[PDB]
Design a protein around this ligand. Structure first.
Ligand code: G6P
Ligand code: G6P
Ligand code: G6P
Lengths: 590, 148, 590
């Protein structure tokens, strides 16, 4: 079997980890016949692949022919789990025959590529090199075995049709991840999911300069023996856009890091949450007037996309929840984190000041408690009891009093833990100001914006992304245009409830495999057949419902959501790949 | 170097005098005689009766000063003394109890300072730490004399 | 309803906590009609009961009549959970009419009491006072309601037949806990459970001076409208001894202290086990040659009874396990604790020496790690990495070397953490020497004997009984003559596996309510129909089976055993009491 992908040497997308995790199961299935094809990169040979100068034990003549004919190729082992047998093909080794190749490419699949797009030319030459390698291999393989070709990415798939143009007896599988033109559709201020039946595809690809990319994407999809797509909604949009119904859906699987004990994922949540509290205390010095044992932590993560990630709907849902909580007379208060990496400079002076004040209060408490420990030790040694008539000392009260005096503050706490480069055009802050969330004492919803990836090297919040995710109570991911969705899957594996939509690939996948997806904590929405107001009202209702449960009910919910990690593991998702490969083999040669 | 090292002696003597610490330790003097175990040639006996005379004199002047005399006289011995090790362990247990109580007090004081108030000592009692402290004091009680 | 027991003011047995826990449910069932009868003790009125000088709101005349007639009684609230309405009757208030009472007691149930047994005379006068109180109450109650009398203990039950001698329209319930003569049977060096069909009861009660006690016990059992017994085997022995088949069995229930999280009982086991390790390290300085992550902790607790608690069978089973582990080439090592309170003086010098050596090693490690922290802090401040060429310092190695030199030991570790007053007649040490367990390096079973109740005031092992029980891995309780059994029930509530026998009340109760009692961790034995060798071989097989599982399997076993706490709670055991009371009411008056 041959895996063809452009993301073997560079980590530009999530395909890298998907392939790395799938390599173990694919190798276990295919023995030593598992080969992977990828481009050669100067930056991806140092600590990314162990180059094997020795010839392949089952393949010696083709490498010699390829090297003698001018092109340069390398064999080796990918520095990932399992046993990978990877080949790296240089992009400049055969850069001297682009004109001849495109001259003989006119009659094959009739694709044209602009001369100023280096990436498209590199993909085209990669496809030519791959089809040449397959031709050489089958010529030198004595035609004894049968070769199956699997393609994961559209740049790497351009050569697939080339194989179909050479009458090569191989099984052709085309797998796509997302539509490139669909990404630009969502920014056109035109409804996309409710108009899926009518696309003027040719022109919208034309004037937007993405015509040829979609052209060979659709050519590869049509020419392939079998076509696969990541999720159900992505399959539907491919059918209504590429005019070809995918044979089967191929959701992405993720390896799960099991623990010795089932409940350990709870303990990792217990301590990590504490690390959050020490932060929030520091961010709320002089305004800590609410019980912190009755506080809920919500968060939304991922790339800084406003409409495509559902930040706005989450914001007005939280505003509605705040309005509702001020009429029910409840004491529950929620804190919402926005891990939205943006462009920022420096830190916020007030936030660091709050951290320093918290540390100073801790130091004062430490000194007073050490004095109390000394006095109590002496009294216990003499054989008495502390009557608290000497712990006053008439001196520690002075320092504690001036500490409390210093803690006093008049201005409101800030909403950002950084300093925005621009503030008149930042959507998040404009929406927050518009809806009226200023972290006031009378409010019941707090907003914390941290436009930077969480890392242990940061001065404030000394935790990475994984620990912070494990510390929260419920992740809200109201995705709008999300092909598959990795963050909700990661949260589900970690063992926390999540809120998703059927529009997202993960939500659609979960909605069609488990009945009644409400008792397991995966709160599904409906942004496809409902208006924005209905969706936000349903989200507010879900948020209130989550706020309604007790601690025991939350423990039940998290425990039940933990058991769903086995569903997303590759051990279960490999069945779809097996089915697709078997169907391709049957279609090619019985 | 004398300030801290003396402290290391106090932690010892406290351990050797659990249940009998009825004198102020800030007014304590430490005398010692070292060297090889020679009785007449090192003046151990004269030091002993001089200290006895000093003890007799200190009980008629009504003074509070108390002296501790160490005899670093290497002799032939086997094993340790069970009472001494018991006293060290009791001192360590008292230290542990004090540490736990002071950690609880630190947590409560941290919370009260965070909310912006003062400790009124109406919640440090907890009706539970007094029980453990009381049984600790009960354990510290001793009837026999400390060993020499 | 009236509860009559001698253990209301004194804690001599476990009936005190049973009644204290049952008071809540009984009061919730009976409203304000729940009254309890108990003796008055000078030591049990200070912080044990709130005396109510005010008359009972529904009862004023009987107390006045009782006080005016010479006897002294008190009303009040028991200082326990729920709302108790307790009456205390003085034992010396009516001590001036013992002769008249026993003169008129000859024709009622024909019982005679020795003059030199003060406790029996006190019980007899208590019964007379109780029956007089019932007579006065029913005379002054206008015979409107119906009174039900419940008796829990045999000393308190002597008056029950007196009521049956006065034609009082009340329901008579007699509940027993154990047979007094059976306790002395087990010390007669004669088989007891295999000869249950033939007892020469009259004589064995005669020459053993327990004739009259059994006499009024059997009289109360026969005269009672209904008879109840703690467990099935106790019911069988009562039927074959008292010649009266109990109507229903009444197992004792225990209140369970629930937690916010289900897995918290695991966490309490995680840290408490650590407190054990710090002990065992101290007890094994200079001989720590086995991995402590693969160590199992077994223990047996309770009163110091040799045959009645199964210490010997546990000992030879552990010896067989040791012999088996030295031929399989396994690395697993088990540590067995014997919490058998005996008479001891002082501590063991070697044990305290080991604790001190462990603390000294900890101090040396702390000093070295502080120096390393300082050096690493400096190197990180200057912006470099620790190359470990300066941490040597040529000085810390000297102190570490002399520390290691001090740690060296030649003699074997001791088997006792105390100093026995006598050693030529202590069964435990004689058996240990006979079977050959000396805590040698080549052995795989370690024995630690701690003849003292575990308390936080102890210098070594600074944990109480509950934490030590929660820290172990499996409690072995091969009871032989145990009426009900509280310790295995406590262990089951705590959430740990246990080993019991059908002879014990708990084992028999569990064996008849849950099918296949092996998957839940309650390993049952058979000491009734099998010889000693068969029982010890089965125990050894069970021990090896427990040693065979992995950590995950042990977690599963403990999690499943935790769920069985609801079975032993009073919420489920109150049904038997309700049934017994209803049957008594039906028998007395329809
Ligand atoms: O999940 P929460 O509602 O915040 O509960 C708080 C903590 O949750 C889990 O970590 C455990 O159950 C802890 O025992 C509990 O203290
Ligand atoms: O030498 P002492 O009488 O014991 O005085 C006690 C200590 O002596 C010296 O170490 C220093 O002067 C210390 O400041 C003092 O606290
Ligand atoms: O029960 P054990 O076999 O000793 O396992 C050791 C500990 O058990 C429980 O306390 C938890 O599962 C811990 O995570 C585990 O470290």
């Amino acid at each position: 079997l041959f895996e063809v992908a452009w993301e073997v040497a560079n980590k530009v997308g999530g395909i890298y980890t998907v392939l790395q995790t799938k390599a173990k199961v694919t190798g276990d299935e295919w023995g030593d016949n598992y080969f992977l094809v990828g481009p050669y990169t100067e930056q991806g040979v140092r600590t990314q692949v162990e180059l094997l100068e020795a010839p392949t034990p089952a393949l010696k003549r083709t490498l010699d022919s390829m090297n003698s004919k001018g092109c340069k190729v390398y064999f080796g082992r990918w520095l990932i789990e399992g046993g990978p047998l990877v080949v790296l093909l240089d992009v400049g080794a055969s850069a001297w025959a682009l004109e001849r190749w495109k001259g003989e490419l006119w009659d094959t699949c009739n694709i044209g590529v602009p001369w100023y797009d280096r990436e498209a030319n590199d993909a085209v030459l990669f496809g030519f090199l791959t089809t040449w390698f397959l031709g050489e291999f089958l010529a030198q393989s004595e035609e004894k075995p049968h070769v199956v070709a699997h393609f994961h990415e559209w740049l790497a798939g351009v050569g697939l049709c080339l194989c179909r143009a050479r009458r090569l007896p191989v099984a052709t599988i085309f797998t796509t991840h997302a539509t490139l033109l669909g990404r630009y559709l969502c920014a056109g201020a035109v409804d996309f999911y409710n108009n899926l039946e009518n696309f003027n595809v040719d022109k919208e690809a034309g004037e937007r300069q993405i015509y040829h990319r979609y052209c060979m994407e659709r050519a590869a999809a049509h020419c392939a023996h079998v076509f696969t797509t990541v999720s159900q909604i992505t399959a539907i949009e491919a059918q209504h856009l590429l005019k070809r119904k995918p044979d089967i859906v191929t959701p992405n699987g993720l390896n799960v890091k099991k623990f010795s004990a089932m409940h350990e994922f709870q303990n990792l949540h217990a301590q990590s949450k504490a690390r959050i509290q020490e932060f929030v205390r520091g961010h709320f010095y002089g305004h800590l007037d609410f019980n912190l044992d009755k506080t809920l932590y919500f968060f939304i993560a991922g790339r800084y996309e406003f409409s495509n990630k559902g930040a706005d709907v989450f914001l007005e849902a939280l505003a509605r929840l705040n309005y509702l909580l001020r009429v029910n007379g409840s004491e529950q208060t929620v804190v919402a984190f926005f891990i939205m990496p943006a462009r920022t400079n420096n830190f916020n002076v007030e936030t660091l000041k709050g951290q320093a004040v918290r540390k100073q209060l801790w130091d004062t408490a430490n000194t007073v408690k050490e004095k109390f420990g000394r006095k109590l030790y002496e009294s216990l040694l003499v054989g008495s009891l502390p009557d608290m008539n000497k712990m006053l000392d008439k001196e520690d009260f002075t320092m504690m009093k001036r500490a409390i005096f210093a803690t006093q503050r008049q201005s409101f706490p800030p909403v950002c833990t950084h300093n925005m480069l621009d503030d008149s055009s930042d959507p998040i802050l404009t929406t927050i100001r518009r809806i009226g969330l200023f972290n006031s004492s009378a409010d019941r919803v707090k907003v914390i914006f941290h436009p930077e990836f969480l890392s242990s090297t940061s001065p404030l919040l000394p935790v990475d992304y994984e620990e912070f995710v494990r510390g929260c109570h419920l992740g809200v991911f109201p995705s709008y245009y999300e092909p598959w969705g990795y963050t909700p899957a990661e949260c589900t594996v970690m063992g926390i409830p999540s809120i998703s939509t059927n529009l997202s690939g993960f939500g659609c996948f979960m909605e069609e495999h488990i009945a009644d997806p409400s008792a397991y904590g995966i709160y599904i929405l409906d942004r496809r057949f409902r208006s924005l107001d209905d969706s936000c009202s349903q989200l507010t209702s879900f948020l209130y419902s989550f706020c309604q449960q007790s601690r025991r009910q939350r423990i039940i919910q998290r425990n039940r959501t933990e058991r769903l990690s086995d569903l997303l593991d590759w051990k279960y998702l490999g069945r779809y790949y097996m089915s697709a490969r078997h169907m391709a083999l049957s279609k090619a040669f019985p």
